[PDB]
Design a binder for this molecule. Structure first.
Ligand code: HEM
Ligand SMILES: CC1(C)[C@@H]2CC[C@@]1(C)C(=O)C2
Ligand SMILES: [K+]
Length: 406
C-alpha cells in the first residue's frame, strides 16, 4: 500500500489506513471488510493515508449529518481519489443545492415512480423470461446470466439504446466505480461521453420518447437544457443503470443460496418480500462516495481543512450497531430497517423506486420457479470493492426436478 504523507493538521491517533478499493479483510465479504471500521479500536472519524489521503466517517450519525450539510460538505468533488472527484462532472451529483434542483426534477421525470409503474410489465416479463430460460439448466453463473442482463436490458429499453452496446458501456462504467488500472476516471468518462454525444445530438434533432430524448430536450431554469448538461446527466443515468442493481442482486442471491429458511419464508409469505428487500438493501449495502470541505470546519471535535475529502460510506450506516442491533444478521422481521443505502440528503437516489421494483420482482419470480438452489460445490465467492462494490462470480446449482414452470 502507498500511504500518502500525513498532513500536519491530522492527529496521529485518528489515522487508520483503510483502502476503499482493496479492504484488508475482503475475503470475509466486502460488507464485513468495511465493518472493521466500526470496531472498538476505531474512532468515529478517521483519516486514511491510502488513495491520496482522506477522512472516513464510520458512524451512521456522522454520515447522515455530513450528507445533510452540503454547505460544509460539497458534492463538487464527491469521488476518491482526488483526480476522480475532480473529473467527475455528472449532473445532478456534482452540484449542491439549490443548483441541482432543476436538474434533479428532470432526471426524476425519466427514472421516477411513474416511469417504473409504466415499465412494470416489461420488468415482470424479462424477469420471468430470463429465469424460465435458466430453470431447466440446473446451474448458472448468476452475475452474467441474470444480475447483469435483467437490470441492464431494462435500462437500455428505457433509454432506447441497443443491447449490442452493453458490453462496451458496462466495461466503461465499471472503470469509474471499480478502477482496474487500465484507464483514469477522466478517460473512462470521456469515452462514455463520446458514445453519448452523437446520440444526444441526433435525439435533439429528431426527439423520441426514450429517456435520452426526454433529458436532451428538457427544460431547466426556464430554458432549454444544453447538449453538455444533457451529456452529463445521461452519463450518470448510464452508471446508475449498469452498475448498481446489477451488483446488489448478486449479494442478495448469494445470501439466499445459503439460507434455505429465508428462501422458504418468502415463498410462503410473499407479502414479506418488500420488507426482505429493505433488509437485504441494509445488510448488503454497497455504495461509498463522499464530499469535499468547502472551508476549515470542526466536525465532532475533529478539525477538517478546506479541500479535505471525506468518504461518507452509505454502506456503513445500516451496519452500524448503534442503528441496528446485530447488524450482520439478516432478519426480515426487523421492526426498523435503518440504512442510507440509497443515500441521504438532497441527492437521495432517484432510481431507488426502479431498484426496489427490480429487486422485489427478482425475489418473487426466482423463488417461484427455483425455490431450491445453492452455491456450486467448491466455488469460492470473491467480492470486489470501490465506489460500488460487487461480486466477481456467483456459480449457482440446483436440481431441475425441484423447479417449476409457471
Ligand atoms: C441498488 C441500487 C442503487 C443504489 C444502492 C443507489 C445508490 C445511490 C446513492 C447512494 C446516491 C447518492 C449519491 C450522493 O449523494 O452523492 C444515488 C443517487 C442517484 N441514483 Fe441511485 N442507486 C441505485 C440505483 C440507481 C438506478 C437504477 C438509477 C437509474 C439509472 C440510479 C440513478 C440515480 C440518480 C439520478 C442519482 C442522483 C440524484 C441527485 O444527484 O440528485 N440509481 N444513488
Ligand atoms: C454513487 C452512485 C451509486 C450514484 C448513482 C451511480 C453512482 C456510482 C453515482 O455516480 C451516483
Ligand atoms: K468535479
Amino acid at each position: 500500500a502507498n500511504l500518502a504523507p500525513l498532513p500536519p493538521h491530522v492527529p496521529e491517533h485518528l489515522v487508520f489506513d483503510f483502502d476503499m478499493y482493496n479492504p484488508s479483510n475482503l475475503s470475509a465479504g466486502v460488507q464485513e471488510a468495511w465493518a472493521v471500521l466500526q470496531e472498538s479500536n476505531v474512532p468515529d472519524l478517521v483519516w486514511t493515508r491510502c488513495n491520496g489521503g482522506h477522512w472516513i466517517a464510520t458512524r451512521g450519525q456522522l454520515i447522515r449529518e455530513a450528507y445533510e450539510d452540503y454547505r460544509h460538505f460539497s458534492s463538487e468533488c464527491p469521488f476518491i481519489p482526488r483526480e476522480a472527484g475532480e473529473a467527475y462532472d455528472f449532473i445532478p451529483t456534482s452540484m449542491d443545492p439549490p443548483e441541482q434542483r432543476q436538474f434533479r426534477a428532470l432526471a426524476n421525470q425519466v427514472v421516477g415512480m411513474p416511469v417504473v409503474d409504466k415499465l412494470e410489465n416489461r420488468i415482470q416479463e424479462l424477469a420471468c423470461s430470463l429465469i424460465e430460460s435458466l430453470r431447466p439448466q440446473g446451474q448458472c453463473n448468476f452475475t452474467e446470466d441474470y444480475a447483469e442482463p435483467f437490470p441492464i436490458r431494462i435500462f437500455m429499453l428505457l433509454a432506447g439504446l441497443p443491447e449490442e452496446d452493453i458490453p462496451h458501456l458496462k466495461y466503461l462504467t465499471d472503470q469509474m466505480t471499480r478502477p482496474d488500472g487500465s484507464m483514469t476516471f477522466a478517460e473512462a468518462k470521456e469515452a462514455l461521453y463520446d458514445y453519448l454525444i452523437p446520440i444526444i445530438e441526433q435525439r435533439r434533432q429528431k426527439p423520441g420518447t426514450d429517456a435520452i430524448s426526454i433529458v436532451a430536450n428538457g427544460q431547466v431554469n426556464g430554458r432549454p437544457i444544453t447538449s453538455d448538461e444533457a451529456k452529463r446527466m445521461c452519463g450518470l443515468l448510464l452508471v446508475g443503470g449498469l452498475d448498481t442493481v446489477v451488483n446488489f442482486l448478486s449479494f442478495s442471491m448469494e445470501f439466499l443460496a445459503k439460507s434455505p429458511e429465508h428462501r422458504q419464508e418468502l415463498i410462503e409469505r410473499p407479502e414479506r418480500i418488500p420488507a426482505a428487500c429493505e433488509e437485504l438493501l441494509r445488510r448488503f449495502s454497497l455504495v461509498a462516495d463522499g464530499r469535499i470541505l468547502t472551508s476549515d470546519y470542526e466536525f465532532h471535535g475533529v478539525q477538517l481543512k478546506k479541500g479535505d475529502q471525506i468518504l461518507l460510506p452509505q454502506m456503513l450506516s445500516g451496519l452500524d450497531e448503534r442503528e441496528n442491533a446485530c447488524p450482520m444478521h439478516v432478519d426480515f422481521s426487523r421492526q426498523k430497517v435503518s440504512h442510507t443505502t440509497f443515500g441521504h440528503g438532497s441527492h437521495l437516489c432517484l432510481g431507488q423506486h426502479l431498484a426496489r421494483r427490480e429487486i422485489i420482482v427478482t425475489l418473487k419470480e426466482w423463488l417461484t420457479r427455483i425455490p431450491d438452489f445453492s452455491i456450486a460445490p467448491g466455488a469460492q465467492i470473491q467480492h470486489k470493492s470501490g465506489i460500488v462494490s460487487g461480486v466477481q462470480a456467483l456459480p449457482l446449482v440446483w436440481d431441475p426436478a425441484t423447479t417449476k414452470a409457471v
